[PDB]
């Protein structure tokens, strides 16, 4: 995030980190319940990547987090590689998340929900800070 | 480098499709929602993340980090997958597995 501020540990409990075998972080994701993760389609997740819930400081010899395994991936059939439209994927967990105090799910909107322009929202992640 | 070790966050305004289009024009498809250009920006490593908005006291998933300025420009609207639109599929997918 460019121009963001460091967050308070455990305050965005739904936020996970998708990493590779070597532990390399390539995309964020959100917890929607103990067995499902919602992420972007272009992240190209695969059954061999890992979901990591519980973190905050990626640079910690060892913390108290969960490494979950990917049961199954579902890219949405309508995703357009060229237009980037319908960029979504669901990851089904092999092992459910133990919800905790640092591990919760986010609420899902209703199809008719209306979010007004000018409203203030938030976004979080571990993405470049400078370009 | 510029790869934070510690989770980050930012507060930003949702844009209306119209005002988004003033920048990205037709590139703005239907299952897309814009926000930002307020002085912050999502950037490399942020995709798949979340964009939350307070609904009735609770944190709701409004969009998913998608793409934008090829440079993480802060004067430029960022675009995300608009959950509202993608929702049913989600539901159904969930429901069937």
């Amino acid at each position: 995030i460019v121009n963001g501020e460091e967050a308070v540990p455990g305050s965005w409990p739904w936020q996970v980190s998708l990493q590779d075998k070597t532990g390399f972080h390539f995309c964020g994701g959100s917890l929607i319940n103990e067995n499902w993760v919602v992420t972007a389609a272009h992240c190209g997740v695969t059954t061999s990547d890992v979901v990591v819930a519980g973190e905050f400081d990626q640079g910690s010899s060892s913390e108290k987090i969960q490494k979950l395994k990917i049961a199954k991936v579902f890219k949405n059939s309508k995703y357009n590689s060229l237009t980037i439209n319908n960029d979504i994927t669901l990851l089904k967990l092999s092992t459910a998340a133990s919800f905790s105090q640092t591990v919760s799910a986010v609420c899902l909107p209703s199809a008719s929900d209306d979010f007004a322009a000018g409203t203030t929202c938030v976004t979080t992640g571990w993405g470049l800070t400078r370009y | 480098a510029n790869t934070p070790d510690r989770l980050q966050q930012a507060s930003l305004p949702l844009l209306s499709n119209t005002n988004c289009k003033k920048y990205w024009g037709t590139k703005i498809k239907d299952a897309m929602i814009c926000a930002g250009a307020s002085g912050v920006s999502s950037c490399m490593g942020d995709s798949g993340g979340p964009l939350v908005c307070k609904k009735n006291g609770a944190w709701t998933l409004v969009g998913i980090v998608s793409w934008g300025s090829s440079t993480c420009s802060t004067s430029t609207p960022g675009v995300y997958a608009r959950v509202t639109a993608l929702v049913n599929w989600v539901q159904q997918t969930l429901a069937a597995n």
């Binding site: 455990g10 305050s11 609420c107 899902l108 938030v122 | 930012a10 609904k55 006291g57 609770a58 709701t60």
Partner: peptide, 11 residues
């Protein structure tokens, strides 16, 4: 959902 144990701050 959407109610963290630990309240986030500023944002």
């Amino acid at each position: 959902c959407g109610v963290p144990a630990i309240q986030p701050v500023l944002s």
